[model samples]
Target chain A: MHLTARGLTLDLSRPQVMGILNNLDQALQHAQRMLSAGATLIDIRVVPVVEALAQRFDVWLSVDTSKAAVITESAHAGAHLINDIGLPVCLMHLMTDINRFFQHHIERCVAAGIAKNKLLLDPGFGFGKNLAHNYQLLAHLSELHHFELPLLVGMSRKSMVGQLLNVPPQQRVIGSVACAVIAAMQGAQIIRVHDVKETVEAMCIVEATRSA
Target chain B: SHMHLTARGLTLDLSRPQVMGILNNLDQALQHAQRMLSAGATLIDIGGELDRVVPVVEALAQRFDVWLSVDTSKAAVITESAHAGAHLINDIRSLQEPGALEAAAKTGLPVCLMHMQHSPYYDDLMTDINRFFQHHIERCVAAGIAKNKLLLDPGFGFGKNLAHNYQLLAHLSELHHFELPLLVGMSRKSMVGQLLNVPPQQRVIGSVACAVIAAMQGAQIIRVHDVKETVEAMCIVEATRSA
Candidate 1:
């Protein structure tokens, strides 16, 4: 349950929380909060994963993107995980089959001089998916295990749970946490979420009952 | 999936899980109840001091439509709470006070009988609890209290070490054998705080976590200090379970 790739070791035995850092106003300040709350990894969007950030934190840095250039640049800058959506699988125009779709991007990830094992596959619950397609992927998320890679799921406060509960994003904490537990229960290696403290607590009970 | 109880004229449909907020502030009893009630508590459990709480229960009973469960083991408090408009009796002593059963029976309040062995040793924990409830229920029945008017609590950290508490929680559904509704109060208790290494005051998130585990296992009433968060957590628990 541990992934060691390109001289970096990412532990997956205990359920890990990947805290999202959407905008980096005080990037290091925000990182301190997530780290203090026990985030196992950090996620940043759009920009390259700042090597200086991990210089202060001993955590794995993941850059969320679909572009290969960013993936290769971030890796060279000391990023360990690529938080890519496996986008080709979701775009109807690009998908002929799910396996072939994932294979296409995954091959390119290694082809771009990045180690294949250093990647975290995300099905991207709400990024390009319709509600039905989101659930279809989640219900069968374990199938992505075929590649023998660590999988991460980010459905926090998404439209799927919002539609299910009929609540706004602010009120979606409870629903989102439940979905995170379900994902963890389904054997997803990592859960990306907001409300760090709450999700960690929810998973405490989940882990207790699971191992109980 | 509703568990209905008629406390004189008031009825609480316990089937749709309810949050029992613990209000221990003697001076600000009424103030705290208002705070927890607006935070979505269906039952405000005020305890550790009930003479002052009876007045708060009376005040809240008048202002809000929520049920007030008096958590105590004293006969006088049990008798007085009923007159002050308290609707339920949640005695950690399991109504074993010298006159607790008689007093609670006289008022017709539904009493929750909790199992706490007092000692930290358990030869066979669950069996001991089930046997204790059987005897306690018989006592209530003998006191002219209807068996149907009683609820059962497994008493999470009452006298249990970590292992016993978890063993009980993981297999809590076994308490269903009594055919009575289950009430669980692990809020700020050592079971959550001690195991998580978080202290009581800051254990709000951990408390909500215990709420999630208990509710998902079919616990009818969840007792806690964080009424707002527990209520929010239960909303998703019920929604997901129902779906």
Candidate 2:
């Protein structure tokens, strides 16, 4: 439940939040408020924002991509973690339908010299995944825990719920909240969400129900 | 989860979670009630302009499959509302009103006794609330009201300051001692505003968050402004609750 990355330490004992920064300048300004809104980890889809956020804020910044070069620089630039879209190959699964969780951990930590504890694994839900493939990855998500690193899920507003709910991006708030809660229930450690304030409160409610 | 109840001859299926819409004596009372029901409210809590709300209550009771909960401190209004098809009584004064308890018992309906000291003084707030329910339940029982036909509301902003309100909410699960269903009325009230430092309208997410917490901790009835939104949030909360 404890993760030490790039020089800082974090506790994932409870459901921790990761707010996705889709754009640079907007995310640069929104980072402060998102942290205030209860995001502990900052996830950026584009690799460039990772360095900027790492330098501007004293929070954990991560790059969510598959490029090895970006991850090497991201780790070197003091980015705490890397979230890769582990090959959307559940069927032809270039390695294994779920090999990337362990495979990426070894590559990034051992091959790239990133700290072992700083890594988080994702089964890349809809990058190139079919609907059935995305759901199959989710249904068997917990078994990936044999790797021992904390799990991260980023299916917020992904096709899994968007297609089913017929809700577009902005109106995907409710569907995304449902996605995060379901992921958390099945051993997903960090939730990457679009709506910071809403997701935080929804997570808080999820945490409250466990006590009773 | 099908919570079934009856008022006079009308029956409501509250098995799923429910949102109670707030209605006043406005010009569009009937329109407002209609919108709430269509938007996911199974009950409407009526206050002020009592006689004006009664007809709307009568109209809805006949046409739609819904319930009406009237919040009144007067016995006559309580009696009239029940006769006109109101299904529940929400007494802010805790039914200490002269003849109020008797009138509520006459309706063959459920009564929600809200706890409001009307003053910012308490030795132990939660224990006091429990004892308040204890004493009132006995009083209600002696007044010929069955213990089965009662609901309890914690009265979030009635007289409580911010700390008292949160303390009550944090241990809201403690109200399970009575084993009756709990009703919470913290939607956009000063409690949500006080905690989030936002205005009432801006408190929608915060209010829904608290409602989710209340439901997670065993509260069955939630009073809210955005009935449809709260219903949506509660539906999500319940789905993940078992996930």
Candidate 3:
């Protein structure tokens, strides 16, 4: 429910104008324009070349990467949250040895002095998980609540809800809302969805009923 | 018995389901109430409490034109609201609350006798609900409240389970035996949401569908959030039923 940074939380649940910028100067300009349009977070997915773009825009940046080097560098370069699109090689190897993985990552993060609050765990639902594995992961997702941090579920228009309902990507709005509702009701704090307005409306209604 | 008075009306709810649009803080409540009346709401129900009625009715006297009903249970609110030109009292707690009947009698306004089970738990929920209405009607009649002035509400989602709620809807015709005007308030209730598996914001379609069904079953008034949509839906239902 809480964002990593301090000011008003920018809900990335809607289809925000990401305006993907491939180069450094373009990324900086895009970040400024997006901030003008009320974008709360800048997603720096390209590389370290765009690290200066975050500094120029004076906004929180989400560094999208899987490699420890990129995450560490991005954090050092002032990225706020790490958006890990966990490739199979990186995630499977980490899960193969949970104790070692946790010990190494935790110790490294602590040793590197990364703030604990800034760490958000994403399971990379579709990158490596097949259809059954994806469902299994989704069913057992509550177990991840043990981590006691914000979980951002980003399966907007993904194959899981769409394919299951035999709907296409564009036609998966109702399906997306259903999944988003279940996720929000089941403790997924940040639902990174494509359909913003409808998702926001849905979230407001569900949250209103939480106390009722 | 008094002659039946039909007027364009819109009922505002403080309970969950559809958006009451937060009229508490903003002047939007007054503006919206005026707009609805202009768009053909002859009566406006200013509900304060959320499903449970136990609030002060100090602010009921601001505007006076439409038949205003203070949706509350406190005798003081009822008494004060009546002074503000409120002609009807819609008590969801039925007339069981202390001094409720006395207040209604004092104001001489019509009373809406709704059926909400005594508890969340129910055995033969539908039967219990029917019995509850029967008991309330008998009590109101005993209180010297005229039969024509008493309105009946088959309370949906107040204490009934989803199945019980739908059962009441399906058998709404049975309520006609009471020979009083029936008010069906199933706009965007959890029963419809659970049935349709939709969130509250997305329950408008389901709400319209249920409202139409209630109108078809001879419901005299529909308490709804989307006034225009519910009115339009009821018109279609009325047309179909007559045809």
Candidate 4:
């Protein structure tokens, strides 16, 4: 596990709750509370919201929107990562029509002096993909890993685990933990989850077994 | 919350519906009890008699720190165990034996009233055993034994066949009506061995599963031979319940 300014980073697939900071003020309050509750990262979906709190907190921030304007605005406003869940289709397609979309954004951010280490790529698992497409995307998650930036997986309590297990949302912790364990073993850097303590314990056990 | 005494040293068996781990050797027994203490066992049971009584209460006293139970049908053994600091008398005979209840009452120690039909035979065994226990409870209560101090054990394989054992187990919840602490002892017993076709030495997992299920069904104490695994299993189960 590697610890960044935000939190520990490691390959042992442990689940972490990236508290959703949807409202501008609620985002800031949620970020503070989540950190207090042992959350390592804050996810802000709105550009203005990210811009509003970026300079206030020292922890890492992930912008949830896929719009290039929002990404550019949030990136310029001190957000360290863009969680483009609307990726490869919305942003990728828009960038394709305009040629060199990601390349241009990287160049613009680089010229604007944003650290290259600050960028992370998410394939937006269910954002644009149909169920089959999402599964295909999950299968090819390693392909996205080629970007070599840290990968964040937010599949906790998601429909995929519930649908696969035939369990309702409240009872999906076991399935979610299983998926988180698999992702950790497969080298996913972060697993987002709501059940922190149990997930942390499970990850510790997994890491212990792996080292053994 | 409710305490019942047994021959083992303040034994807190968490095994499949917890059963006592009667360590046969004193030094080994004490060492094992120390480990159980560290692993969160609050009671230990020391039986002087395996199937018959032994005059070794003083010997047991030298080895353990907690309450002891002399597992014997002989009144003399119960007196000796009480003399050596035993706090409860666990009678497998359901105190039906001559002088057993009198000895326990004289000692002022609590009693565990277990169920076993006479002749080791029954028609509708669980029902018969349940009725047998109902009679035992009335007799003990009438004899001035405090109701709160009495513990109940449904003897899994004492006089019961496999079907009888399971019928009692499947309806173990009925024991709650007695409103007394229920101690279950299916650990390494024939009931589990018969079901799994495994020998006593290999029945720990099945035993622990029984303990967990018993706990789920509101059993106060599960008697088991494997103390540590049972405790850990209960911890995991409790943790899951908390989650």
Candidate 5:
């Protein structure tokens, strides 16, 4: 799957890693490391860093905030995919029937003049679901394929892994990678992760085996 | 079709990937086996000489409830290990030693045949492997070994270059037609070090990645030096695969 925004075509045919950064201190250097470590997208929650990262790197900048003020400013600052301005919109499933929730939002987006090809879906692991509920969603992630849009999953260091594996956030790399691999095998296109390097390595293996 | 191997009253369900830990340290053999078991290895592969291999095999079989595999081609070691309660025979030489096949058959334990060609050359890698496996399977059966008590390993980094290793991995599922379990071991080998330019100790992530790839293609057993990480990765593969 490919998404075109800001005149840049993003190929998400294979699973792409999106590195998440929250702190502002040395944000550019951190983003650079993420890109160097094979992250295709740098997700920042701040707008100031978005413009700087955009000017510095030849990669996609994703805004993590859904707040209008940050999204508006982030777009002006050169964010490629975000809480939208004709940019690719990631419809995250917070709660409710995911199948209907996704279909409804997709119809709404298309009716609102958002191109179907520019849309992405995230089942929103750990957002508002229980442990069993999360695994159930993961097991059925492929059902989202009915929508024919790229799938984006973020279960990295989430309670789903932490709770199931009984590990703290710091020790969640393996569990997180496992979740990422499971989702990727289900055809997830973008994996949002805190452990960029490990996830990237796992995705490489996933892609190699997938294509084979 | 689902494939599985049964030996010494234990069954390995190949429907899910299994992690086989390498236990090669003679001085610390028992300690290493304990650690590998703790790290989630269902099978411990003992690789050493005849004298060194039997004691560890006996100690592990006496202590643990896990499968024990002796990595040797010597007829003496094979016969002794079977008496020492070894569950599987993993011969890197494919049991070509004079009496290896007869010894392995007499033991009634599953045997893993690895493809190794010194100064490797193949006109067609997968086909060449298929031919090797076909011939070996016939030989094993002729030697009175049951077909169910057999496994196949492509022998990554044994006698092949980078391309050969990967091409075998890429077409791994093609081997399923033989109706046997697939075992792969590429832990910290040049297949990873040469590709990543890293040393053995630094190859954990790369090795786990390789294991996960092989597991994805239904490679039943993954032998690795890093048992813990590979076990974690296999958990992921199983969940995804069975999901």
Candidate 6:
């Protein structure tokens, strides 16, 4: 699987890391640190920061916005991937028969003139379920491949890890990395994380083992 | 592959992966054992001379209901630790010492035969490991040890370079051809330090990464130094695997 934007094509044959940043101050500096730590993309929420980052770095700029006006300005300011709340669409599965639910969304997007190649799937861990329900989606995450689109999972330090391990957000690093590795091993193309350096290291192990 | 072991009438269930914490100091042995057990370590691996090892094993056995594994290749230590209530014999030499095999077999305890190369050389790394385990399995069974009572360890840093260690780890699941439980120890070893270029004391995250990788491929027993973090990571692995 692959994602193409702004004259650059990201080869998702191996797992990639998307570092999460929700700040305007020192945004550029933090993005550089994540990029230096092997992040393939930077996920941001503000338009000016997206424009600022787009000018500085030649990597994929992913914007997380829900409003049509924000989406319009983000495209003009140079955003590459649109993480849904706004796809190239992160069709998230929320407490449904995920297979047909994703299929219905795909059909709607196609009818709305969006190409099938411009789609991704997120299992929506901790979106609207109890602990057991979230794990059930994770165990059966690979079954989503029947759609054959790229898979992007964000289970980094969410309530799933915090509640299961009985740890707060800061102490959920190892458990968070475990969830990322499991998702990557089952062929998750992009892993969104707060700890980019550590998640990058874990992804290296997963890639080495898978390609060996 | 089946994932449980029978040792000293206790079932070491590997279906969910187990953590084996290390004991390096005798002065703080009991305190450390208590901490690791409380942190969710199912097995405590003690390493030292016979005088220290036997007493620590006896002390821990009398105090806790955890599995005691003695790390020694000496025949006398193997025999003595078994009588002192050690459930597993983790020999780095693969019990190749003169009377080590005989003593371990007579104890009727589970044995972990680790692969350690004095001169590490391999045309193909996995091929050499398969051949090594094949030869050692034949030798152990011929010495009257039950085939079902054995575990395999691809000794991570024992005379191996960085590439050699990682290759063994990447292909760790291939050892299941024998269908016995697999044990691994890459805790704060050079494999983590040299790969990430960090010091031993700062390799907790790197070491946890290795443990998660091994457990994902169904490694039964993960031997490590940081018990709490590894135990937390193993819980995530089990949830993902059994879900």
Best prediction by lDDT: 6
Cα RMSD of all models vs. native, in order, equals 4.8, 5.5, 15.4, 18.7, 3.1, 2.7
- Candidate 2 lDDT over B71-121, as tens digits, reads 888988888887787889888987888989888887778898888875597
Interface RMSD for all numbered candidates? 3.5, 5.5, 14.1, 14.8, 2.9, 1.6
lDDT of 5 by residue, A1-212 (tens): 68877878889889999989875658988888899889998877477798788788879888767687777788899999884216788888622388888879888988999788888888888878887788778777888888798888998888877765677789888877877877887789999988898888777666755665
Give Cα distance to truth, residue B160, candidate 6, Å: 4.4
**Quality class of the docking in candidate 1, CAPRI style:** acceptable
- CA lDDT of each prediction against the hidden true structure: 0.76, 0.73, 0.58, 0.59, 0.83, 0.86
DockQ list for all candidates: 0.30, 0.22, 0.01, 0.02, 0.36, 0.57
Question: Can you write out model 1's per-residue Cα lDDT over B115-138, one digit (the tens) per residue?
Answer: 987459889888899999999999
Model 5 chain A: which ten-residue window has the lowest total lDDT?
A81-90
Clash list (residue pairs), candidate 5: none
TM-score of each: 0.82, 0.78, 0.47, 0.49, 0.89, 0.91
- Candidate 5 residue B171 Cα shift, in angstroms, is 3.6
Clashing residue pair totals per candidate (backbone < 3 A): 2, 3, 2, 28, 0, 0
- TM-score of chain A for each candidate? 0.78, 0.77, 0.63, 0.60, 0.93, 0.95
Q: What value does the lDDT take at residue A36 in candidate 2?
A: 90
Residue B199, model 3: lDDT of 73
- Sorted by DockQ (best first), the order is 6, 5, 1, 2, 4, 3
Off by over 4 Å in 5: A83-85, A94-97, B1-4, B8-15, B25-27, B118-124
Top DockQ prediction, candidate number: 6
Worst 10 residues of 2 chain B by lDDT: B234-243
Chain B structural similarity (TM-score) per candidate: 0.94, 0.92, 0.81, 0.82, 0.96, 0.96
Instruction: Give the lDDT ranking, best first.
Output: 6, 5, 1, 2, 4, 3
Q: Report the candidate with higher lDDT, 2 versus 3.
A: 2
Stretches of model 4 off by over 4 angstroms after superposition = A1-212, B1-20, B49-64, B118-123, B241-243
Worst window of 10 by summed lDDT in candidate 3 chain B: B14-23
In angstroms, the error of model 6 at A196 is: 1.6
Better of 2 and 6 by TM-score: 6
